[PDB]
Enzyme design. Structure first.
Site, short mmCIF file in Angstrom:
data_model
loop_
_atom_site.label_atom_id
_atom_site.label_comp_id
_atom_site.label_asym_id
_atom_site.label_seq_id
_atom_site.Cartn_x
_atom_site.Cartn_y
_atom_site.Cartn_z
N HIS A 186 21.77 52.25 76.36
CA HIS A 186 20.60 52.98 75.88
C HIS A 186 19.32 52.20 76.19
O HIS A 186 18.22 52.76 76.15
CB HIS A 186 20.71 53.25 74.38
CG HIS A 186 19.85 54.38 73.90
ND1 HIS A 186 19.93 54.89 72.63
CD2 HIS A 186 18.90 55.11 74.53
CE1 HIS A 186 19.06 55.87 72.49
NE2 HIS A 186 18.42 56.03 73.63
N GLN A 511 7.33 55.81 70.08
CA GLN A 511 7.59 54.46 69.59
C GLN A 511 7.02 53.48 70.60
O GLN A 511 7.04 53.74 71.81
CB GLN A 511 9.09 54.23 69.41
CG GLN A 511 9.78 55.22 68.50
CD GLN A 511 11.17 54.77 68.10
OE1 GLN A 511 11.36 53.65 67.64
NE2 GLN A 511 12.15 55.65 68.29
N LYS A 514 8.20 52.00 74.33
CA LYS A 514 8.12 52.75 75.57
C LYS A 514 6.96 52.30 76.46
O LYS A 514 6.86 52.69 77.62
CB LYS A 514 8.01 54.25 75.28
CG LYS A 514 9.19 54.81 74.51
CD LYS A 514 9.09 56.32 74.37
CE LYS A 514 10.30 56.89 73.64
NZ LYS A 514 10.26 58.37 73.61
N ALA A 568 3.81 59.60 60.31
CA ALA A 568 3.62 60.69 59.36
C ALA A 568 4.92 61.47 59.14
O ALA A 568 5.85 61.35 59.93
CB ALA A 568 2.52 61.62 59.85
N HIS A 573 3.03 65.16 61.52
CA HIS A 573 3.04 64.55 62.85
C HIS A 573 2.82 65.58 63.95
O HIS A 573 2.04 65.36 64.88
CB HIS A 573 4.35 63.80 63.07
CG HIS A 573 4.68 63.56 64.51
ND1 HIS A 573 5.78 64.11 65.12
CD2 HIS A 573 4.04 62.84 65.46
CE1 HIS A 573 5.82 63.73 66.39
NE2 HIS A 573 4.77 62.96 66.62
N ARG A 576 -0.89 67.30 63.36
CA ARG A 576 -2.06 66.46 63.63
C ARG A 576 -2.25 66.18 65.12
O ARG A 576 -3.22 65.53 65.51
CB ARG A 576 -1.99 65.15 62.84
CG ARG A 576 -1.00 64.13 63.36
CD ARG A 576 -1.03 62.87 62.52
NE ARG A 576 0.02 61.93 62.89
CZ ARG A 576 0.23 60.77 62.28
NH1 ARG A 576 -0.53 60.41 61.25
NH2 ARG A 576 1.21 59.97 62.68
N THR A 594 9.08 63.91 71.10
CA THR A 594 7.64 63.81 70.88
C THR A 594 6.85 64.58 71.92
O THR A 594 5.73 65.04 71.66
CB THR A 594 7.18 62.34 70.89
OG1 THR A 594 7.64 61.72 72.10
CG2 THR A 594 7.76 61.59 69.70
N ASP A 597 6.68 67.99 70.83
CA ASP A 597 5.84 68.06 69.64
C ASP A 597 4.36 68.25 69.99
O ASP A 597 3.68 69.08 69.38
CB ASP A 597 6.02 66.81 68.77
CG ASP A 597 7.42 66.70 68.18
OD1 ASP A 597 8.08 67.75 68.02
OD2 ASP A 597 7.86 65.57 67.88
#
Ligand SMILES: CC(=O)N[C@@H]1[C@@H](O)[C@H](O)[C@@H](CO)S[C@@H]1OP(=O)(O)OP(=O)(O)OC[C@H]1O[C@@H](n2ccc(=O)[nH]c2=O)[C@H](O)[C@@H]1O
Length: 700
Positions: A186, A511, A514, A568, A573, A576, A594, A597
């Site tokens: 991973h 995160q 990255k 958040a 998250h 915003r 993400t 998102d």
């Protein structure tokens, strides 16, 4: 002096190097029958039993080894590893600390102690103990590689290039010595390893499962040849430990319920116990069958249960992640087994047939980086439930303050009714039927700003419930995690997060691991060319913030150029993200979940596809969206695209409007179409198998 059992011990040591594990056990046992007080024989036998998964029995011999030789610091350390695997982190920690106290120079115990801290989020403590381990034993690949990942998480780029050079040389040396690489599969996506190296790492780790299942001595499972017992329905089995409050569940929770019950019978196999969240409830209530395998610890019985269900296609949604039980797939209870969604990489294993991806994520010219055959979805293999989880973000409104769309945003199910209660609502028209209601700076508008600035939980305007974006968890905690849809109107302002009310906001909610030195340099170039812009990051973790800032100072960025925020709740998250102008994706490893998102917020995302799967997901999401002009072929194009978005405000408006419309019109967030396309792909696999063929590439 060599005894009789001493020779038997040496003989078994040879067998362990040969790979002949089962014979090594017999020789270790025969040695203990000759000399019951043989400490080394106990330690060695337990080290083998640990590989076989026989933890309880390994633990038995570890204690005996210590009873005989109280100074066996090596036996303490290995017993800890066993306890650590037995979920007894308490007892494991004690073993390591006891070992260090007996022998302070024993490097392995320090490394194992650091691993406990690492798994517990205690990164600075983990780094500290790894350095001690390395100070004692300089040639310590496991410790060095783990420390490398620790430094990655907190963005410690001290001697980064030198460190990357050594990581590769370690993996290379290990692969050439035919030993298990110290880099976890991973984590292989982060380092400049070759494609061949990464697949080799996945292969080596896959073979660890073979040892754990060979001890079961189970015959091959007889697989179905038709769909007769299944009444013409294909039986698809989804195996995951992430059925609950986990990113995986967020993306695919709708999918099982959207399957066609005339052609498909869905079986969900949970590797984790019920956490009580609504995500678990939905899957249990919509999947044709839900099986809690977390209550079936033995892989043999669990695999039997899967086979007894008559599964045709079994789906691996974990791969090499936390909570994975790949021993299940290694036993091959199903004729067709595929990787899907959960793990952004190859399994490198023989027991895995297909890997569900797409043309953009995994083009055919790099199919040699996967061990499994490619199984293309029509557009993108990625999916999200944002349409179901956050339908209140489908439409928004803004408040003026002398017209922008990311300064003060209002979202809500009953939002349109609230606006009809307002006197002077301006309706601004977007282009490429869509509109954005604008509230002027009046008495009502000032009342909302008051709530925000004061830090109030909520207010009431004309009977409507106006909520504070920062207080969603105090109003409805279910809505905060995304388990429910908020039943109030939520206010989201830049002032809440310390964002300047007049600046171009570049955001990245990934995160911090990255980000590599070249990415921050790439972002600094953008920020310098766009003087009135800021970079919005997250304290993920918080200890990475001083590091990221420090390097930004060295590149020539004042501190106020990068703005940080805490992590958040899931709903906050996503919501915003509406405050940002452009999302700058991380090239080393794209934002996957993400990435979905920021797009649901209608925020454009600039990405640069790499060569690894994980570094190409974002671009795959954008091609499906329809925004090809947000994809860069190199670093210069990446910086250029972002700089244009930050300086050409009319171009930025066109792109933002493009994402805002095509997040609904494109199949990117269409879970129903995705399921059907997934089902179409399932049948191609089965018909290929039923025809008597072995797995091969599926390019529609
Ligand atoms: C590289 C990699 O491992 N990719 C994986 C993919 O391959 C899998 O397909 C995805 C499904 O399992 S998981 C994983 O997806 P990634 O995109 O790396 O996200 P990662 O695991 O860091 O957490 C992001 C979460 O934190 C939430 N999150 C984040 C910030 C915040 O402030 N609040 C918040 O709720 C977000 O809403 C998310 O819920």
């Amino acid at each position: 002096c060599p005894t009789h059992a001493d020779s038997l011990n040496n003989l078994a040591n040879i067998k362990r190097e040969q790979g002949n594990i089962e014979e090594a056990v017999r020789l270790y046992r025969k040695a203990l029958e000759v000399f019951p007080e043989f400490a080394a024989a106990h330690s060695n036998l337990a080290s083998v039993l640990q590989q076989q998964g026989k933890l309880q029995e390994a633990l038995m011999h570890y204690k005996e080894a210590i009873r005989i030789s109280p100074t066996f610091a090596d036996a303490y350390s290995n017993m800890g590893n066993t306890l650590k695997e037995m979920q007894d982190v308490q007892g494991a920690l004690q073993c390591y600390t006891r070992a260090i106290q007996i022998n302070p120079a024993f490097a392995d115990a320090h490394s194992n102690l650091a691993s406990i801290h690492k798994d517990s989020g205690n990164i600075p403590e983990a780094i500290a103990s790894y350095r001690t381990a390395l100070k004692l034993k300089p040639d310590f690949p496991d410790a060095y590689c783990n420390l490398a990942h620790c430094l990655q998480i907190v963005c410690d780029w001290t001697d980064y290039d030198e460190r990357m050079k050594k990581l590769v040389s370690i993996v290379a040396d290990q692969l050439e010595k035919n030993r298990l690489p110290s880099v976890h599969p991973h984590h292989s996506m982060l380092y400049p390893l070759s494609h061949g190296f990464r697949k080799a790492i996945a292969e080596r780790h896959g073979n660890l499962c073979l040892d754990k299942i060979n001890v079961l001595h189970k015959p091959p499972y007889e697989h179905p040849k038709d769909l007769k017992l299944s009444d013409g329905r294909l039986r698809v089995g989804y195996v995951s430990s992430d059925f609950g409050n986990h990113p995986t569940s967020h993306l695919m929770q709708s999918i099982p319920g959207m399957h066609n019950p005339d052609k498909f019978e869905v079986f969900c196999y949970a590797l984790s116990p019920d956490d009580g969240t609504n995500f678990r409830v939905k899957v249990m209530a919509e999947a044709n069958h839900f099986i809690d395998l977390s209550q079936i610890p033995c892989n043999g019985k669990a695999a039997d249960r899967i086979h007894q269900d008559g599964i045709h296609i079994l789906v691996n949604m974990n791969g090499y992640t936390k909570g994975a039980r790949n021993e299940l797939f290694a036993l091959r209870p199903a004729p067709i087994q595929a990787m899907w969604l959960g793990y952004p990489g190859t399994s490198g294993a023989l027991f895995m047939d297909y890997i569900i991806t797409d043309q953009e994520t995994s083009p055919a010219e790099v199919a040699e980086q996967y061990s499994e055959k490619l199984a293309y979805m029509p557009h993108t293999f990625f999916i999200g439930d944002h349409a179901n989880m956050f339908p209140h973000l489908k439409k928004k409104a803004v408040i003026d303050f002398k017209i922008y769309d990311n300064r003060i945003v209002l979202n809500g199910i009953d939002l349109k009714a609230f606006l009809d209660s307002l006197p002077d609502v301006k309706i601004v028209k977007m282009k490429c039927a869509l509109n954005m209601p604008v509230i002027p700076m009046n008495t009502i508008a000032e009342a909302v700003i008051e709530m925000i600035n004061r830090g109030q939980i909520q207010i009431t305007i004309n009977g409507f419930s106006i909520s504070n974006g920062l207080a969603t968890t105090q109003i409805n905690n279910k809505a905060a995690t995304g388990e429910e849809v908020p039943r109030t109107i939520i206010v989201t302002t830049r002032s809440q997060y310390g964002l300047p009310e007049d600046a171009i906001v570049y955001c990245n909610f990934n995160q911090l691991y990255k980000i590599d030195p070249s990415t921050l340099q790439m972002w600094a170039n953008i920020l310098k060319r766009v003087p009135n812009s800021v970079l919005w990051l997250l304290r993920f973790p918080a200890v990475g913030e001083p590091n990221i800032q420090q390097y930004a100072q060295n590149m020539g960025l004042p501190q106020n150029r990068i703005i940080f925020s805490p992590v958040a709740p899931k709903e906050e998250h996503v919501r915003r993200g509406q405050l940002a102008d452009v999302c700058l994706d991380t090239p080393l490893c794209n934002g996957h979940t993400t990435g979905m998102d920021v797009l649901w917020a209608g925020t454009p995302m600039v990405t640069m596809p790499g060569e690894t799967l994980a570094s190409r997901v974002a671009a795959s999401q954008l091609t499906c969206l329809g925004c090809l002009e947000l994809i860069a072929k190199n670093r210069q194009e990446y910086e250029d695209i972002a700089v244009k978005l930050g300086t050409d405000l009319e171009y930025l408006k066109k792109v933002r409007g493009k994402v805002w419309k095509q997040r609904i019109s494109s199949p990117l967030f269409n879970t129903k179409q995705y399921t059907m396309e997934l089902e179409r792909l399932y049948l191609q696999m089965w018909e290929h198998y039923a025809a008597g063929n072995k797995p091969d590439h599926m390019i529609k």
